[PDB]
Assembly symmetry: C6
Amino acid sequence: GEIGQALKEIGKALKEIGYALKEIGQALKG
Amino acid sequence: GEIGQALKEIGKALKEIGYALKEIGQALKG
Amino acid sequence: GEIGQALKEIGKALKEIGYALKEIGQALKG
Amino acid sequence: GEIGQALKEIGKALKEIGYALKEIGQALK
Amino acid sequence: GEIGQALKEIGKALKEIGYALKEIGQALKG
Amino acid sequence: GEIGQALKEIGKALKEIGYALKEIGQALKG
């Protein structure tokens, strides 16, 4: 439905944020 | 609807947060 | 309504977070 | 109501995250 | 309810994210 | 339900973000 699909896109954006934070952590490790 | 469109804007703000973290990681990397 | 307005405030808070991250990335570039 | 109050608490958590990020920005200076 | 308790767990994770950012801020100036 | 399960995936993504931030903070110490 409308709300569920909108929540799935929010979940997708959060996974992308989580991925970007791992990259940051990798960068800080050298 | 009201709730669906409000969630959509939250989704956009989260994608923008992801983009900004991506840039931070690239700046730390380089 | 109650929920829609509360989701709008959450959306504004995420915009501010996104902005603060852009500021951090701009600092890291300068 | 139940959902609105839980969303207000989520907004409150987002304000503290914003605040911590601004302290991080100034720590980088 | 189902949704209320799910949103309370989301608030809980966000509070943990807040703390984690505080500790980053301390590691940075410290 | 659809919405409750979507919210649990969002909660899990946020716990993953908190965890990545703790790793960043630990890396900024050592």
